[PDB]
Amino acid sequence: GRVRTKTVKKSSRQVIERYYSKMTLDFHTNKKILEEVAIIPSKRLRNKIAGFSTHLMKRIQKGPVRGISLKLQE
């Protein structure tokens, strides 16, 4: 199966919380943003976190997501 681990989930949540302004819905742009604003030891981990962040952004566009606190939403 493909279940994101606690590390990926936490990293994506924190990245979205801290840099929601620059986030986009495109995986490549999100991964570039992650490379810019974070230190990820592994490229595979970076891609996984970027994909999960894109998914979380897609959900946020629909509406509130539990576990993520956005200043503008609040």
Partner RNA sequence: UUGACAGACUGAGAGCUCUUUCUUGAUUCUAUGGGUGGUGGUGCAUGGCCGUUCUUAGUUGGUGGAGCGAUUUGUCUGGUUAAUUCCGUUAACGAACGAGACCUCAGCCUGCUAACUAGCUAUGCGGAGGUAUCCCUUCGCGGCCAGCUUCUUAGAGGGACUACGGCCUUUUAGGCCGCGGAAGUUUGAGGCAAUAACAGGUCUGUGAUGCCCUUAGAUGUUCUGGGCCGCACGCGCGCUACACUGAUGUAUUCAACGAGUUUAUAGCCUUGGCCGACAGGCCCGGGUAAUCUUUGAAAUUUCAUCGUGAUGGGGAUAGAUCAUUGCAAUUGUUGGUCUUCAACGAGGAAUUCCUAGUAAGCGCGAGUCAUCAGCUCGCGUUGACUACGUCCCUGCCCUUUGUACACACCG
CB atoms within 10 A of CB 49: 26
| Chain residues 32-51 in contact with RNA, contact rule CB under 7 A | 41-45, 47-48, 50-51
Q: For residue 35, what are its two tokens?
A: 């490379």
Interface with RNA (CB under 7 A), residue total: 30
Contact 38, 74 (CB under 8 A): no
Residues that contact other proteins, how many (by CB under 8 A): 14
Given a contact cutoff of 8 angstroms between Cβ atoms, the answer to whether 34 and 46 are in contact is yes
CA contacts within 13 A on the Cβ side of 17: 12
Residues in contact with other proteins by the rule CB under 8 A: 7, 11, 14-15, 18-19, 37-42, 45, 49
**Contact footprint for RNA (CB under 7 A):** 1-7, 9, 25, 27-28, 31, 41-45, 47-48, 50-52, 54-55, 58-59, 62-63, 66-67
